[PDB]
Coordinates of all heavy atoms in Angstrom, one line a residue:
Chain G
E54 N 98.3 154.9 -44.2 CA 99.0 153.8 -43.6 C 100.5 154.0 -43.5 O 101.1 153.6 -42.4 CB 98.9 152.6 -44.6 CG 99.2 151.3 -44.0 CD 98.3 150.8 -42.9 OE1 97.1 151.3 -42.8 OE2 98.6 149.9 -42.1
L55 N 101.3 154.6 -44.3 CA 102.6 154.8 -44.3 C 103.0 155.8 -43.0 O 104.0 155.6 -42.5 CB 103.2 155.2 -45.6 CG 104.8 155.4 -45.6 CD1 105.4 154.1 -45.4 CD2 105.2 156.0 -47.0
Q56 N 102.1 156.6 -42.7 CA 102.4 157.6 -41.7 C 102.5 156.8 -40.3 O 103.2 157.4 -39.5 CB 101.2 158.5 -41.5 CG 101.6 159.8 -40.8 CD 100.3 160.8 -40.6 OE1 99.2 160.3 -40.6 NE2 100.4 162.0 -40.2
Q57 N 102.0 155.7 -40.1 CA 102.2 154.9 -39.0 C 103.6 154.7 -38.6 O 104.1 154.9 -37.5 CB 101.3 153.6 -38.9 CG 101.6 152.7 -37.7 CD 100.6 151.6 -37.7 OE1 99.5 151.6 -38.4 NE2 100.7 150.8 -36.6
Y58 N 104.4 154.1 -39.6 CA 105.8 153.9 -39.4 C 106.6 155.2 -39.6 O 107.8 155.2 -39.1 CB 106.3 152.9 -40.5 CG 105.4 151.7 -40.6 CD1 104.5 151.5 -41.6 CD2 105.7 150.6 -39.5 CE1 103.7 150.3 -41.7 CE2 104.8 149.6 -39.6 CZ 103.9 149.3 -40.7 OH 103.1 148.3 -40.7
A59 N 106.2 156.2 -40.4 CA 106.8 157.5 -40.5 C 107.1 158.1 -39.2 O 108.2 158.7 -39.0 CB 106.1 158.4 -41.4
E60 N 106.1 157.9 -38.2 CA 106.2 158.5 -36.9 C 107.2 157.7 -36.0 O 108.0 158.2 -35.3 CB 104.9 158.6 -36.2 CG 103.9 159.6 -36.9 CD 104.3 161.1 -36.9 OE1 105.0 161.5 -35.9 OE2 103.9 162.0 -37.7
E61 N 107.1 156.4 -36.1 CA 107.9 155.5 -35.3 C 109.3 155.7 -35.5 O 110.2 155.6 -34.7 CB 107.4 154.0 -35.4 CG 108.1 153.1 -34.5 CD 107.6 151.6 -34.6 OE1 107.3 151.1 -35.7 OE2 107.5 150.9 -33.5
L62 N 109.7 155.7 -36.9 CA 111.1 155.9 -37.2 C 111.8 157.0 -36.5 O 112.8 156.9 -35.8 CB 111.2 156.1 -38.8 CG 112.7 156.0 -39.3 CD1 113.1 154.5 -39.4 CD2 112.7 156.7 -40.7
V63 N 111.1 158.2 -36.6 CA 111.8 159.4 -35.9 C 111.5 159.3 -34.4 O 112.5 159.7 -33.7 CB 111.0 160.6 -36.3 CG1 111.7 161.9 -35.9 CG2 110.8 160.8 -37.8
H64 N 110.6 158.7 -33.9 CA 110.5 158.5 -32.5 C 111.6 157.6 -31.8 O 112.2 158.0 -30.9 CB 109.1 157.8 -32.1 CG 109.0 157.4 -30.7 ND1 108.8 158.4 -29.6 CD2 108.8 156.2 -30.0 CE1 108.7 157.8 -28.5 NE2 108.8 156.4 -28.7
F65 N 112.0 156.6 -32.5 CA 113.1 155.8 -32.2 C 114.4 156.3 -32.5 O 115.5 156.0 -32.0 CB 113.0 154.2 -32.7 CG 112.0 153.4 -31.8 CD1 110.8 153.0 -32.3 CD2 112.4 153.1 -30.5 CE1 110.0 152.3 -31.4 CE2 111.5 152.3 -29.7 CZ 110.3 151.9 -30.2
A66 N 114.5 157.2 -33.4 CA 115.7 157.7 -33.9 C 116.3 158.7 -32.9 O 117.5 159.0 -32.9 CB 115.7 158.4 -35.2
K67 N 115.5 159.4 -32.0 CA 115.9 160.4 -31.1 C 116.4 159.9 -29.7 O 117.0 160.7 -29.1 CB 114.8 161.4 -30.9 CG 114.5 162.2 -32.2 CD 113.9 163.6 -31.8 CE 112.4 163.4 -31.3 NZ 111.9 164.6 -30.7
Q68 N 116.3 158.7 -29.4 CA 116.6 158.0 -28.1 C 118.1 158.2 -28.0 O 118.8 158.5 -26.9 CB 116.0 156.9 -27.9 CG 114.6 156.6 -27.9 CD 114.0 155.4 -27.4 OE1 114.7 154.6 -26.9 NE2 112.8 155.2 -27.4
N69 N 118.9 157.9 -28.9 CA 120.3 157.8 -28.9 C 120.8 156.8 -28.0 O 121.5 157.1 -27.1 CB 120.9 159.2 -28.8 CG 122.3 159.3 -29.0 OD1 122.9 158.7 -29.7 ND2 123.0 160.0 -28.2
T70 N 120.4 155.6 -28.2 CA 120.7 154.4 -27.3 C 121.1 153.3 -28.2 O 120.6 153.2 -29.4 CB 119.6 154.1 -26.4 OG1 118.4 153.9 -27.0 CG2 119.4 155.1 -25.4
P71 N 122.0 152.3 -27.7 CA 122.2 151.2 -28.5 C 121.1 150.3 -29.0 O 121.0 149.8 -30.0 CB 123.2 150.4 -27.7 CG 123.0 150.9 -26.4 CD 122.6 152.2 -26.4
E72 N 120.1 150.3 -28.1 CA 118.8 149.5 -28.3 C 118.0 150.1 -29.3 O 117.5 149.4 -30.2 CB 118.2 149.2 -27.0 CG 118.9 148.4 -25.9 CD 118.1 147.9 -24.8 OE1 117.0 148.6 -24.5 OE2 118.5 147.0 -24.1
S73 N 117.7 151.4 -29.4 CA 117.0 152.1 -30.2 C 117.7 152.2 -31.6 O 117.0 152.2 -32.6 CB 116.7 153.5 -29.7 OG 115.7 154.0 -30.5
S74 N 118.9 152.3 -31.6 CA 119.7 152.2 -32.8 C 119.5 151.0 -33.6 O 119.4 151.1 -34.9 CB 121.3 152.5 -32.5 OG 121.4 153.6 -31.9
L75 N 119.4 149.9 -33.0 CA 119.0 148.6 -33.6 C 117.7 148.6 -34.2 O 117.6 148.2 -35.4 CB 119.2 147.4 -32.8 CG 119.4 146.0 -33.2 CD1 120.7 145.7 -33.7 CD2 119.0 145.0 -32.3
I76 N 116.7 149.1 -33.6 CA 115.4 149.2 -34.1 C 115.4 150.2 -35.4 O 114.7 149.9 -36.4 CB 114.3 149.7 -33.1 CG1 114.2 148.6 -32.0 CG2 113.1 150.1 -33.7 CD1 113.7 149.1 -30.7
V77 N 116.1 151.3 -35.2 CA 116.2 152.2 -36.4 C 116.9 151.6 -37.5 O 116.4 151.7 -38.8 CB 116.9 153.4 -36.0 CG1 117.2 154.4 -37.2 CG2 116.2 154.2 -34.9
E78 N 117.9 150.8 -37.4 CA 118.6 150.0 -38.3 C 117.7 149.0 -39.1 O 117.9 148.8 -40.2 CB 119.9 149.4 -37.9 CG 121.1 150.2 -37.5 CD 122.2 149.6 -36.8 OE1 122.5 148.3 -37.1 OE2 122.9 150.2 -35.9
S79 N 116.8 148.5 -38.3 CA 115.9 147.5 -38.7 C 114.8 148.1 -39.5 O 113.7 147.4 -39.8 CB 115.4 146.6 -37.7 OG 114.7 145.5 -38.1
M80 N 114.7 149.4 -40.0 CA 113.7 150.0 -40.7 C 114.2 151.0 -41.9 O 113.5 151.7 -42.4 CB 113.0 150.9 -39.7 CG 112.2 150.1 -38.6 SD 111.2 151.2 -37.6 CE 109.9 151.7 -38.6
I81 N 115.6 150.8 -42.3 CA 116.0 151.5 -43.4 C 117.0 150.5 -44.2 O 117.4 149.5 -43.8 CB 116.9 152.8 -42.9 CG1 116.7 153.9 -44.0 CG2 118.4 152.4 -42.8 CD1 115.4 154.6 -43.6
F82 N 117.1 150.9 -45.5 CA 117.8 150.1 -46.5 C 119.1 150.9 -47.0 O 120.2 150.4 -46.9 CB 117.0 149.7 -47.6 CG 116.1 148.5 -47.4 CD1 114.8 148.5 -47.3 CD2 116.6 147.2 -47.3 CE1 114.0 147.5 -47.1 CE2 115.8 146.2 -47.1 CZ 114.5 146.4 -46.9
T83 N 119.0 152.0 -47.6 CA 120.0 152.7 -48.2 C 120.8 153.6 -47.1 O 120.1 154.1 -46.2 CB 119.5 153.6 -49.2 OG1 118.6 154.5 -48.9 CG2 118.9 152.7 -50.4
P84 N 122.0 153.8 -47.3 CA 122.8 154.7 -46.4 C 122.4 156.2 -46.5 O 122.6 156.9 -45.5 CB 124.2 154.4 -46.8 CG 124.2 153.4 -47.7 CD 122.9 153.3 -48.3
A85 N 122.0 156.7 -47.7 CA 121.5 158.1 -47.8 C 120.4 158.4 -46.8 O 120.4 159.4 -46.1 CB 121.1 158.3 -49.2
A86 N 119.4 157.5 -46.7 CA 118.3 157.7 -45.8 C 118.8 157.7 -44.3 O 118.4 158.5 -43.5 CB 117.2 156.7 -45.9
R87 N 119.7 156.8 -44.0 CA 120.3 156.7 -42.6 C 121.1 158.1 -42.3 O 120.8 158.7 -41.2 CB 121.3 155.7 -42.6 CG 121.7 155.2 -41.1 CD 123.0 154.5 -41.0 NE 123.1 153.6 -42.2 CZ 122.6 152.5 -42.3 NH1 121.7 152.0 -41.4 NH2 122.8 151.7 -43.3
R88 N 121.8 158.6 -43.2 CA 122.6 159.8 -43.2 C 121.6 161.0 -42.9 O 121.9 161.8 -42.0 CB 123.6 160.1 -44.1 CG 124.4 161.3 -44.2 CD 125.3 161.5 -45.2 NE 124.9 161.4 -46.4 CZ 124.3 162.2 -47.2 NH1 124.1 163.5 -46.7 NH2 123.9 162.1 -48.4
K89 N 120.6 161.1 -43.7 CA 119.7 162.1 -43.6 C 118.9 162.2 -42.4 O 118.8 163.1 -41.6 CB 118.8 162.2 -44.9 CG 117.9 163.5 -44.8 CD 117.3 163.7 -46.2 CE 116.3 164.8 -46.2 NZ 115.6 164.9 -47.5
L90 N 118.5 160.9 -41.9 CA 117.7 160.7 -40.7 C 118.6 161.2 -39.4 O 118.0 161.8 -38.6 CB 117.2 159.4 -40.5 CG 116.3 159.0 -39.3 CD1 115.0 159.7 -39.4 CD2 116.3 157.5 -39.2
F91 N 119.8 160.8 -39.4 CA 120.7 161.1 -38.3 C 121.6 162.4 -38.4 O 122.2 162.6 -37.5 CB 121.6 159.9 -38.1 CG 121.0 158.7 -37.5 CD1 120.8 157.5 -38.1 CD2 120.6 158.7 -36.2 CE1 120.2 156.5 -37.5 CE2 120.0 157.6 -35.6 CZ 119.9 156.5 -36.3
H92 N 121.4 163.2 -39.3 CA 122.1 164.4 -39.6 C 121.3 165.6 -39.9 O 121.8 166.7 -39.9 CB 123.3 164.2 -40.5 CG 124.3 163.2 -40.2 ND1 125.5 163.5 -39.6 CD2 124.3 161.9 -40.2 CE1 126.1 162.4 -39.3 NE2 125.4 161.5 -39.7
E93 N 120.0 165.4 -40.2 CA 119.1 166.5 -40.7 C 117.8 166.5 -40.0 O 117.3 167.6 -39.6 CB 118.9 166.6 -42.2 CG 120.3 166.7 -43.1 CD 120.0 166.9 -44.5 OE1 119.1 167.8 -44.8 OE2 120.6 166.2 -45.3
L94 N 117.3 165.4 -39.8 CA 116.0 165.1 -39.1 C 116.1 165.1 -37.5 O 115.3 165.7 -37.0 CB 115.2 163.9 -39.6 CG 115.0 163.9 -41.2 CD1 114.3 162.6 -41.6 CD2 114.2 165.1 -41.6
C95 N 117.0 164.4 -37.2 CA 117.2 164.3 -35.6 C 117.5 165.7 -35.0 O 116.8 166.0 -34.0 CB 118.4 163.3 -35.3 SG 117.7 161.7 -35.0
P96 N 118.5 166.5 -35.5 CA 118.6 167.8 -35.0 C 117.4 168.7 -35.1 O 117.1 169.5 -34.3 CB 119.8 168.3 -35.7 CG 120.4 167.3 -36.3 CD 119.4 166.3 -36.5
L97 N 116.5 168.6 -36.2 CA 115.5 169.3 -36.4 C 114.4 169.2 -35.4 O 114.0 170.1 -34.7 CB 114.9 169.1 -37.8 CG 113.6 169.8 -38.3 CD1 113.9 171.2 -38.3 CD2 113.1 169.3 -39.4
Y98 N 113.9 168.0 -35.2 CA 112.9 167.7 -34.2 C 113.4 167.4 -32.8 O 113.2 166.4 -32.2 CB 112.1 166.5 -34.6 CG 111.6 166.6 -36.1 CD1 111.8 165.6 -36.9 CD2 110.8 167.7 -36.6 CE1 111.3 165.5 -38.3 CE2 110.3 167.8 -37.9 CZ 110.6 166.7 -38.7 OH 110.2 166.7 -40.0
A99 N 114.3 168.4 -32.3 CA 114.9 168.3 -31.1 C 114.0 168.5 -30.0 O 114.0 168.0 -28.9 CB 116.1 169.1 -30.9
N100 N 113.1 169.6 -30.1 CA 112.0 170.1 -29.3 C 110.7 169.6 -29.7 O 109.7 170.1 -29.0 CB 112.1 171.5 -29.1 CG 113.5 172.0 -28.6 OD1 114.0 171.4 -27.8 ND2 114.0 173.1 -29.1
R101 N 110.4 168.8 -30.7 CA 109.2 168.4 -31.0 C 108.8 167.0 -30.4 O 109.5 166.0 -30.7 CB 109.1 168.2 -32.7 CG 107.8 168.4 -33.2 CD 107.7 168.5 -34.7 NE 106.7 169.5 -35.2 CZ 106.8 170.8 -35.0 NH1 107.8 171.4 -34.6 NH2 105.7 171.6 -35.5
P102 N 107.8 166.9 -29.4 CA 107.5 165.8 -28.7 C 107.2 164.6 -29.7 O 107.4 163.4 -29.4 CB 106.4 166.0 -27.8 CG 106.5 167.6 -27.6 CD 107.0 168.1 -28.9
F103 N 106.3 164.9 -30.7 CA 105.7 163.9 -31.7 C 105.1 164.6 -32.8 O 105.3 165.8 -33.0 CB 104.7 163.1 -30.8 CG 104.5 161.6 -31.2 CD1 105.6 160.8 -31.1 CD2 103.4 161.2 -31.9 CE1 105.5 159.5 -31.4 CE2 103.3 159.9 -32.3 CZ 104.4 159.0 -32.1
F104 N 104.4 163.8 -33.7 CA 103.7 164.3 -34.8 C 104.5 165.0 -35.8 O 104.4 166.2 -36.0 CB 102.5 165.0 -34.3 CG 101.4 164.3 -33.7 CD1 101.0 164.5 -32.3 CD2 100.7 163.3 -34.4 CE1 100.1 163.8 -31.8 CE2 99.6 162.6 -33.8 CZ 99.4 162.9 -32.4
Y105 N 105.5 164.3 -36.4 CA 106.4 165.0 -37.4 C 106.0 164.9 -38.8 O 106.6 165.4 -39.8 CB 107.8 164.4 -37.2 CG 108.2 163.9 -35.9 CD1 108.1 162.6 -35.4 CD2 108.7 164.9 -34.9 CE1 108.4 162.2 -34.2 CE2 109.0 164.5 -33.7 CZ 108.9 163.2 -33.4 OH 109.3 162.7 -32.1
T106 N 104.7 164.2 -39.1 CA 104.2 164.1 -40.4 C 102.8 164.4 -40.4 O 102.1 164.7 -39.4 CB 104.4 162.7 -41.0 OG1 103.8 161.8 -40.3 CG2 105.9 162.3 -40.9
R107 N 102.2 164.6 -41.7 CA 100.8 164.9 -41.9 C 100.4 164.4 -43.3 O 101.1 164.1 -44.0 CB 100.5 166.4 -41.8 CG 101.5 167.2 -42.7 CD 101.0 168.7 -42.6 NE 102.0 169.5 -43.3 CZ 102.6 170.7 -42.7 NH1 102.4 171.0 -41.5 NH2 103.5 171.3 -43.4
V108 N 99.1 164.3 -43.5 CA 98.4 163.8 -44.7 C 97.6 164.9 -45.2 O 96.8 165.6 -44.5 CB 97.7 162.4 -44.5 CG1 97.0 162.0 -45.8 CG2 98.6 161.4 -44.0
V109 N 97.7 165.3 -46.5 CA 96.9 166.3 -47.1 C 96.1 165.6 -48.3 O 96.7 165.0 -49.2 CB 97.7 167.4 -47.7 CG1 96.9 168.5 -48.4 CG2 98.6 168.1 -46.6
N110 N 94.8 165.8 -48.3 CA 93.9 165.2 -49.4 C 93.9 166.3 -50.6 O 93.7 167.4 -50.3 CB 92.5 165.0 -48.8 CG 91.7 164.1 -49.7 OD1 92.0 163.9 -50.9 ND2 90.6 163.6 -49.3
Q111 N 93.9 165.7 -51.7 CA 94.0 166.5 -53.0 C 92.5 166.9 -53.5 O 92.4 167.7 -54.4 CB 94.8 165.8 -54.1 CG 96.2 165.7 -53.7 CD 97.1 165.0 -54.8 OE1 96.6 165.0 -55.9 NE2 98.2 164.6 -54.6
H112 N 91.5 166.1 -53.0 CA 90.1 166.2 -53.5 C 90.0 166.0 -55.0 O 89.3 166.8 -55.7 CB 89.5 167.5 -53.0 CG 89.5 167.6 -51.5 ND1 90.5 168.3 -50.8 CD2 88.7 167.1 -50.6 CE1 90.2 168.4 -49.5 NE2 89.1 167.6 -49.4

Side-chain angles (χ1 to χ4, degrees):
Chain G
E54 194 66 21
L55 189 60
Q56 203 189 14
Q57 175 164 357
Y58 310 103
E60 296 291 336
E61 184 173 43
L62 191 80
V63 191
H64 176 65
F65 278 112
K67 291 206 292 171
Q68 303 190 7
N69 190 36
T70 62
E72 306 190 332
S73 193
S74 307
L75 203 76
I76 292 158
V77 177
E78 291 169 36
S79 197
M80 295 180 74
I81 218 78
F82 285 108
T83 59
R87 198 204 321 285
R88 178 177 60 76
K89 190 162 176 189
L90 181 70
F91 288 108
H92 305 258
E93 301 188 44
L94 300 179
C95 268
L97 183 62
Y98 310 126
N100 306 319
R101 204 167 217 80
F103 212 66
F104 290 119
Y105 325 102
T106 67
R107 58 176 163 231
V108 178
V109 181
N110 193 348
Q111 300 180 12
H112 304 93

